[PDB]
mmCIF file of all heavy atoms in Angstrom:
data_model
loop_
_atom_site.group_PDB
_atom_site.id
_atom_site.type_symbol
_atom_site.label_atom_id
_atom_site.label_comp_id
_atom_site.label_asym_id
_atom_site.label_seq_id
_atom_site.Cartn_x
_atom_site.Cartn_y
_atom_site.Cartn_z
ATOM 1 N N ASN A 1 0.799 -1.240 0.036
ATOM 2 C CA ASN A 1 -0.014 -0.038 0.017
ATOM 3 C C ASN A 1 0.853 1.269 0.006
ATOM 4 O O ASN A 1 0.402 2.291 -0.567
ATOM 5 C CB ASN A 1 -0.941 0.007 1.146
ATOM 6 C CG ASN A 1 -1.972 -1.066 1.230
ATOM 7 O OD1 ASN A 1 -2.560 -1.455 2.251
ATOM 8 N ND2 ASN A 1 -2.350 -1.618 -0.006
ATOM 9 N N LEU A 2 1.943 1.298 0.665
ATOM 10 C CA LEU A 2 2.771 2.455 0.752
ATOM 11 C C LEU A 2 3.225 2.988 -0.635
ATOM 12 O O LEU A 2 3.138 4.102 -0.993
ATOM 13 C CB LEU A 2 3.989 2.257 1.641
ATOM 14 C CG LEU A 2 3.805 2.564 3.167
ATOM 15 C CD1 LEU A 2 2.525 1.932 3.772
ATOM 16 C CD2 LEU A 2 5.041 2.139 3.893
ATOM 17 N N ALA A 3 3.675 2.045 -1.573
ATOM 18 C CA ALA A 3 4.093 2.308 -2.898
ATOM 19 C C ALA A 3 2.900 2.666 -3.807
ATOM 20 O O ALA A 3 3.006 3.619 -4.573
ATOM 21 C CB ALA A 3 4.719 1.047 -3.437
ATOM 22 N N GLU A 4 1.712 2.036 -3.518
ATOM 23 C CA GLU A 4 0.557 2.199 -4.444
ATOM 24 C C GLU A 4 -0.245 3.472 -4.063
ATOM 25 O O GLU A 4 -1.053 3.907 -4.779
ATOM 26 C CB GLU A 4 -0.341 0.952 -4.383
ATOM 27 C CG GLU A 4 0.521 -0.194 -4.855
ATOM 28 C CD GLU A 4 -0.162 -1.531 -4.904
ATOM 29 O OE1 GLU A 4 -1.179 -1.769 -4.181
ATOM 30 O OE2 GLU A 4 0.401 -2.539 -5.449
ATOM 31 N N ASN A 5 0.037 4.065 -2.862
ATOM 32 C CA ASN A 5 -0.512 5.357 -2.492
ATOM 33 C C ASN A 5 -0.165 6.517 -3.436
ATOM 34 O O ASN A 5 -0.916 7.460 -3.449
ATOM 35 C CB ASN A 5 -0.155 5.723 -1.050
ATOM 36 C CG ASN A 5 -0.969 4.943 -0.030
ATOM 37 O OD1 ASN A 5 -2.046 4.433 -0.311
ATOM 38 N ND2 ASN A 5 -0.559 5.049 1.189
ATOM 39 N N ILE A 6 0.875 6.434 -4.218
ATOM 40 C CA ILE A 6 1.276 7.488 -5.204
ATOM 41 C C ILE A 6 0.098 7.838 -6.142
ATOM 42 O O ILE A 6 -0.089 9.009 -6.339
ATOM 43 C CB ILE A 6 2.495 7.015 -6.028
ATOM 44 C CG1 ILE A 6 3.731 6.998 -5.181
ATOM 45 C CG2 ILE A 6 2.665 7.903 -7.273
ATOM 46 C CD1 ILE A 6 4.871 6.155 -5.750
ATOM 47 N N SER A 7 -0.623 6.928 -6.616
ATOM 48 C CA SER A 7 -1.789 7.178 -7.461
ATOM 49 C C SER A 7 -3.126 7.241 -6.772
ATOM 50 O O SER A 7 -4.132 7.110 -7.431
ATOM 51 C CB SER A 7 -1.774 6.321 -8.719
ATOM 52 O OG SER A 7 -1.836 4.927 -8.396
ATOM 53 N N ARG A 8 -3.138 7.331 -5.412
ATOM 54 C CA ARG A 8 -4.450 7.171 -4.704
ATOM 55 C C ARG A 8 -5.418 8.316 -4.798
ATOM 56 O O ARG A 8 -6.621 8.202 -4.934
ATOM 57 C CB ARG A 8 -4.238 6.783 -3.266
ATOM 58 C CG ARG A 8 -5.453 6.235 -2.547
ATOM 59 C CD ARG A 8 -5.526 4.749 -2.822
ATOM 60 N NE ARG A 8 -4.574 3.982 -2.357
ATOM 61 C CZ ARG A 8 -4.097 2.814 -2.706
ATOM 62 N NH1 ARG A 8 -4.688 2.130 -3.709
ATOM 63 N NH2 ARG A 8 -3.063 2.205 -2.070
ATOM 64 N N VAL A 9 -4.880 9.611 -4.688
ATOM 65 C CA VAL A 9 -5.759 10.764 -4.567
ATOM 66 C C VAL A 9 -5.178 12.060 -5.219
ATOM 67 O O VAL A 9 -3.943 12.335 -5.073
ATOM 68 C CB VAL A 9 -6.227 10.964 -3.123
ATOM 69 C CG1 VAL A 9 -5.066 11.137 -2.139
ATOM 70 C CG2 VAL A 9 -7.248 11.946 -3.038
ATOM 71 N N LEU A 10 -6.064 12.790 -5.783
ATOM 72 C CA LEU A 10 -5.760 14.088 -6.404
ATOM 73 C C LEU A 10 -5.628 15.115 -5.194
ATOM 74 O O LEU A 10 -6.492 15.162 -4.391
ATOM 75 C CB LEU A 10 -6.818 14.576 -7.409
ATOM 76 C CG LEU A 10 -6.800 16.017 -7.888
ATOM 77 C CD1 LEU A 10 -5.588 16.263 -8.749
ATOM 78 C CD2 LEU A 10 -8.098 16.337 -8.669
ATOM 79 N N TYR A 11 -4.519 15.868 -5.287
ATOM 80 C CA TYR A 11 -4.372 17.054 -4.285
ATOM 81 C C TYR A 11 -5.423 18.147 -4.675
ATOM 82 O O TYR A 11 -5.470 18.628 -5.831
ATOM 83 C CB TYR A 11 -2.926 17.541 -4.324
ATOM 84 C CG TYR A 11 -2.077 16.767 -3.408
ATOM 85 C CD1 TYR A 11 -1.649 15.570 -3.758
ATOM 86 C CD2 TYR A 11 -1.821 17.223 -2.110
ATOM 87 C CE1 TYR A 11 -0.852 14.758 -2.882
ATOM 88 C CE2 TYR A 11 -1.035 16.494 -1.228
ATOM 89 C CZ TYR A 11 -0.581 15.330 -1.596
ATOM 90 O OH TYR A 11 0.223 14.598 -0.661
ATOM 91 N N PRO A 12 -6.241 18.526 -3.685
ATOM 92 C CA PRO A 12 -7.276 19.538 -3.973
ATOM 93 C C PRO A 12 -6.932 21.046 -3.574
ATOM 94 O O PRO A 12 -7.836 21.925 -3.644
ATOM 95 C CB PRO A 12 -8.484 19.022 -3.104
ATOM 96 C CG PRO A 12 -7.843 18.453 -1.899
ATOM 97 C CD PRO A 12 -6.496 17.919 -2.352
ATOM 98 N N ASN A 13 -5.671 21.238 -3.111
ATOM 99 C CA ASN A 13 -5.346 22.580 -2.651
ATOM 100 C C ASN A 13 -4.826 23.409 -3.741
ATOM 101 O O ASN A 13 -3.595 23.511 -3.995
ATOM 102 C CB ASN A 13 -4.385 22.511 -1.344
ATOM 103 C CG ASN A 13 -3.182 21.565 -1.542
ATOM 104 O OD1 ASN A 13 -2.064 22.002 -1.271
ATOM 105 N ND2 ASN A 13 -3.420 20.378 -1.937
ATOM 106 N N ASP A 14 -5.765 24.160 -4.426
ATOM 107 C CA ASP A 14 -5.466 24.949 -5.658
ATOM 108 C C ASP A 14 -5.104 26.424 -5.300
ATOM 109 O O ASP A 14 -5.063 27.213 -6.154
ATOM 110 C CB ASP A 14 -6.586 24.781 -6.598
ATOM 111 C CG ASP A 14 -7.939 25.404 -6.109
ATOM 112 O OD1 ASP A 14 -8.112 25.601 -4.838
ATOM 113 O OD2 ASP A 14 -8.826 25.648 -6.932
ATOM 114 N N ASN A 15 -5.074 26.727 -4.010
ATOM 115 C CA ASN A 15 -4.796 28.189 -3.638
ATOM 116 C C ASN A 15 -3.412 28.454 -3.177
ATOM 117 O O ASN A 15 -2.957 29.561 -3.426
ATOM 118 C CB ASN A 15 -5.773 28.601 -2.527
ATOM 119 C CG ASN A 15 -6.357 27.462 -1.764
ATOM 120 O OD1 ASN A 15 -5.771 26.938 -0.878
ATOM 121 N ND2 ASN A 15 -7.528 27.075 -2.225
ATOM 122 N N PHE A 16 -2.767 27.412 -2.519
ATOM 123 C CA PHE A 16 -1.576 27.790 -1.705
ATOM 124 C C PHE A 16 -0.673 26.544 -1.933
ATOM 125 O O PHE A 16 -0.977 25.432 -1.679
ATOM 126 C CB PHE A 16 -2.041 27.876 -0.280
ATOM 127 C CG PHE A 16 -0.839 28.226 0.691
ATOM 128 C CD1 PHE A 16 -0.312 29.549 0.631
ATOM 129 C CD2 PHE A 16 -0.316 27.293 1.462
ATOM 130 C CE1 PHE A 16 0.728 29.860 1.505
ATOM 131 C CE2 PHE A 16 0.752 27.613 2.339
ATOM 132 C CZ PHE A 16 1.193 28.907 2.341
ATOM 133 N N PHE A 17 0.587 26.817 -2.347
ATOM 134 C CA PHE A 17 1.577 25.793 -2.518
ATOM 135 C C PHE A 17 1.990 25.202 -1.154
ATOM 136 O O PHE A 17 2.403 25.957 -0.243
ATOM 137 C CB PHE A 17 2.752 26.193 -3.393
ATOM 138 C CG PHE A 17 3.776 25.050 -3.435
ATOM 139 C CD1 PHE A 17 3.415 23.936 -4.112
ATOM 140 C CD2 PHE A 17 4.995 25.138 -2.704
ATOM 141 C CE1 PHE A 17 4.376 22.867 -4.214
ATOM 142 C CE2 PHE A 17 5.836 24.075 -2.810
ATOM 143 C CZ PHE A 17 5.572 22.917 -3.600
ATOM 144 N N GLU A 18 1.965 23.905 -0.994
ATOM 145 C CA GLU A 18 2.372 23.212 0.236
ATOM 146 C C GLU A 18 3.294 22.006 -0.280
ATOM 147 O O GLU A 18 2.784 21.242 -1.042
ATOM 148 C CB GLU A 18 1.162 22.686 0.942
ATOM 149 C CG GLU A 18 1.426 22.332 2.485
ATOM 150 C CD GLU A 18 0.065 22.017 3.182
ATOM 151 O OE1 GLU A 18 -0.801 21.300 2.557
ATOM 152 O OE2 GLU A 18 -0.077 22.435 4.332
ATOM 153 N N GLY A 19 4.508 22.080 0.069
ATOM 154 C CA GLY A 19 5.473 20.992 -0.361
ATOM 155 C C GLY A 19 5.320 19.655 0.438
ATOM 156 O O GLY A 19 5.932 19.509 1.465
ATOM 157 N N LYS A 20 4.535 18.901 -0.091
ATOM 158 C CA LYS A 20 4.257 17.539 0.525
ATOM 159 C C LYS A 20 4.981 16.424 -0.328
ATOM 160 O O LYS A 20 4.814 16.402 -1.508
ATOM 161 C CB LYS A 20 2.760 17.243 0.626
ATOM 162 C CG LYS A 20 2.060 18.138 1.673
ATOM 163 C CD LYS A 20 2.355 17.722 3.113
ATOM 164 C CE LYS A 20 1.573 18.541 4.158
ATOM 165 N NZ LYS A 20 2.352 19.663 4.647
ATOM 166 N N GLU A 21 5.775 15.563 0.400
ATOM 167 C CA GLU A 21 6.546 14.536 -0.386
ATOM 168 C C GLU A 21 5.710 13.587 -1.321
ATOM 169 O O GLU A 21 6.055 13.355 -2.414
ATOM 170 C CB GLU A 21 7.248 13.643 0.671
ATOM 171 C CG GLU A 21 8.397 12.759 -0.043
ATOM 172 C CD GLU A 21 8.814 11.618 0.748
ATOM 173 O OE1 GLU A 21 7.977 10.840 1.327
ATOM 174 O OE2 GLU A 21 10.080 11.363 0.780
ATOM 175 N N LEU A 22 4.497 13.318 -0.833
ATOM 176 C CA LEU A 22 3.621 12.488 -1.697
ATOM 177 C C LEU A 22 3.278 13.131 -3.121
ATOM 178 O O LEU A 22 3.113 12.500 -4.087
ATOM 179 C CB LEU A 22 2.365 12.030 -0.925
ATOM 180 C CG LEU A 22 1.409 11.096 -1.650
ATOM 181 C CD1 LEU A 22 2.108 9.827 -2.105
ATOM 182 C CD2 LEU A 22 0.186 10.734 -0.817
ATOM 183 N N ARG A 23 3.126 14.448 -3.065
ATOM 184 C CA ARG A 23 2.802 15.198 -4.315
ATOM 185 C C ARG A 23 4.056 15.243 -5.160
ATOM 186 O O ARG A 23 3.972 15.096 -6.348
ATOM 187 C CB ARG A 23 2.286 16.585 -4.035
ATOM 188 C CG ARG A 23 2.203 17.546 -5.221
ATOM 189 C CD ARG A 23 1.223 16.919 -6.338
ATOM 190 N NE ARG A 23 1.136 17.974 -7.420
ATOM 191 C CZ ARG A 23 0.067 18.243 -8.118
ATOM 192 N NH1 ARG A 23 -1.112 17.849 -7.848
ATOM 193 N NH2 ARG A 23 0.225 19.241 -9.043
ATOM 194 N N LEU A 24 5.240 15.365 -4.598
ATOM 195 C CA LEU A 24 6.449 15.355 -5.412
ATOM 196 C C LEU A 24 6.603 13.967 -6.035
ATOM 197 O O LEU A 24 7.023 13.861 -7.174
ATOM 198 C CB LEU A 24 7.712 15.706 -4.449
ATOM 199 C CG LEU A 24 9.051 15.782 -5.179
ATOM 200 C CD1 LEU A 24 9.058 16.889 -6.325
ATOM 201 C CD2 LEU A 24 10.143 16.024 -4.223
ATOM 202 N N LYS A 25 6.330 12.924 -5.304
ATOM 203 C CA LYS A 25 6.432 11.617 -5.913
ATOM 204 C C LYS A 25 5.394 11.438 -7.139
ATOM 205 O O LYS A 25 5.751 10.825 -8.069
ATOM 206 C CB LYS A 25 6.095 10.416 -4.846
ATOM 207 C CG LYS A 25 7.149 10.298 -3.756
ATOM 208 C CD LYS A 25 6.623 9.371 -2.667
ATOM 209 C CE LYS A 25 7.720 9.028 -1.711
ATOM 210 N NZ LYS A 25 7.180 7.961 -0.804
ATOM 211 N N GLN A 26 4.273 12.027 -6.874
ATOM 212 C CA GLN A 26 3.337 11.996 -8.018
ATOM 213 C C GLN A 26 3.838 12.655 -9.314
ATOM 214 O O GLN A 26 3.610 12.195 -10.398
ATOM 215 C CB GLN A 26 1.970 12.739 -7.644
ATOM 216 C CG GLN A 26 1.175 11.873 -6.818
ATOM 217 C CD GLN A 26 -0.084 12.534 -6.377
ATOM 218 O OE1 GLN A 26 -0.256 13.692 -6.443
ATOM 219 N NE2 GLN A 26 -1.183 11.755 -5.984
ATOM 220 N N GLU A 27 4.469 13.795 -9.088
ATOM 221 C CA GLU A 27 5.035 14.621 -10.178
ATOM 222 C C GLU A 27 6.158 13.884 -10.852
ATOM 223 O O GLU A 27 6.251 13.982 -12.074
ATOM 224 C CB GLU A 27 5.347 16.022 -9.638
ATOM 225 C CG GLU A 27 4.224 16.902 -9.239
ATOM 226 C CD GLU A 27 4.602 18.277 -8.782
ATOM 227 O OE1 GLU A 27 5.746 18.531 -8.669
ATOM 228 O OE2 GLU A 27 3.652 19.111 -8.595
ATOM 229 N N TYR A 28 6.946 13.221 -10.085
ATOM 230 C CA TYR A 28 8.101 12.490 -10.772
ATOM 231 C C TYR A 28 7.544 11.180 -11.413
ATOM 232 O O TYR A 28 8.052 10.921 -12.586
ATOM 233 C CB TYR A 28 9.179 12.162 -9.775
ATOM 234 C CG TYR A 28 10.313 11.404 -10.455
ATOM 235 C CD1 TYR A 28 10.970 12.104 -11.545
ATOM 236 C CD2 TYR A 28 10.660 10.138 -10.252
ATOM 237 C CE1 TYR A 28 11.959 11.429 -12.243
ATOM 238 C CE2 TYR A 28 11.721 9.503 -10.845
ATOM 239 C CZ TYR A 28 12.384 10.168 -11.882
ATOM 240 O OH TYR A 28 13.417 9.587 -12.565
ATOM 241 N N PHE A 29 6.655 10.519 -10.767
ATOM 242 C CA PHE A 29 6.033 9.322 -11.299
ATOM 243 C C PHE A 29 5.508 9.537 -12.694
ATOM 244 O O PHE A 29 5.834 8.780 -13.582
ATOM 245 C CB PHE A 29 4.867 8.944 -10.332
ATOM 246 C CG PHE A 29 4.199 7.659 -10.673
ATOM 247 C CD1 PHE A 29 4.784 6.446 -10.474
ATOM 248 C CD2 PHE A 29 2.826 7.690 -11.112
ATOM 249 C CE1 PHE A 29 4.118 5.194 -10.703
ATOM 250 C CE2 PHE A 29 2.197 6.512 -11.378
ATOM 251 C CZ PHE A 29 2.853 5.300 -11.216
ATOM 252 N N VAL A 30 4.652 10.557 -12.876
ATOM 253 C CA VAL A 30 4.080 10.791 -14.173
ATOM 254 C C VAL A 30 5.198 11.103 -15.314
ATOM 255 O O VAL A 30 5.155 10.554 -16.381
ATOM 256 C CB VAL A 30 2.963 11.893 -14.214
ATOM 257 C CG1 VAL A 30 3.574 13.200 -13.924
ATOM 258 C CG2 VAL A 30 2.150 11.938 -15.445
ATOM 259 N N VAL A 31 6.129 11.908 -14.896
ATOM 260 C CA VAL A 31 7.223 12.328 -15.867
ATOM 261 C C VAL A 31 8.186 11.156 -16.140
ATOM 262 O O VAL A 31 8.594 10.953 -17.360
ATOM 263 C CB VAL A 31 8.041 13.516 -15.119
ATOM 264 C CG1 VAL A 31 9.445 13.611 -15.527
ATOM 265 C CG2 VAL A 31 7.223 14.775 -15.216
ATOM 266 N N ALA A 32 8.594 10.320 -15.183
ATOM 267 C CA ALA A 32 9.537 9.263 -15.423
ATOM 268 C C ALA A 32 8.988 8.178 -16.285
ATOM 269 O O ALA A 32 9.572 7.764 -17.182
ATOM 270 C CB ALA A 32 10.014 8.702 -14.116
ATOM 271 N N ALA A 33 7.651 7.802 -16.027
ATOM 272 C CA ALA A 33 7.061 6.787 -16.820
ATOM 273 C C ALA A 33 6.767 7.257 -18.273
ATOM 274 O O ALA A 33 6.977 6.584 -19.246
ATOM 275 C CB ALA A 33 5.757 6.305 -16.098
ATOM 276 N N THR A 34 6.247 8.510 -18.360
ATOM 277 C CA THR A 34 5.962 9.119 -19.644
ATOM 278 C C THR A 34 7.114 9.223 -20.553
ATOM 279 O O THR A 34 7.115 8.818 -21.687
ATOM 280 C CB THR A 34 5.279 10.515 -19.422
ATOM 281 O OG1 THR A 34 4.013 10.380 -18.771
ATOM 282 C CG2 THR A 34 5.062 11.146 -20.808
ATOM 283 N N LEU A 35 8.237 9.730 -19.994
ATOM 284 C CA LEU A 35 9.489 9.852 -20.827
ATOM 285 C C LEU A 35 10.167 8.589 -21.385
ATOM 286 O O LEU A 35 10.531 8.533 -22.475
ATOM 287 C CB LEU A 35 10.536 10.762 -20.066
ATOM 288 C CG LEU A 35 10.298 12.239 -20.293
ATOM 289 C CD1 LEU A 35 11.133 13.052 -19.295
ATOM 290 C CD2 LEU A 35 10.594 12.706 -21.716
#
């Protein structure tokens, strides 16, 4: 489950940047697989 949590939920905080590790993993995940 820890690994599979990467694709579990969309971040809904569209007002204020908050640096959360799980969002960073999401952003790398999409880029690394896509490329």
Side-chain angles (χ1 to χ4, degrees):
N1 297 156
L2 273 47
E4 299 175 348
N5 281 344
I6 287 160
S7 58
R8 196 80 68 202
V9 61
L10 169 68
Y11 275 80
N13 48 132
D14 63 344
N15 20 84
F16 184 75
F17 180 69
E18 203 171 39
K20 292 285 185 266
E21 198 198 41
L22 182 57
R23 172 60 178 219
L24 184 60
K25 292 171 170 191
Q26 283 179 340
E27 290 181 353
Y28 184 60
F29 184 69
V30 70
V31 154
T34 299
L35 276 166

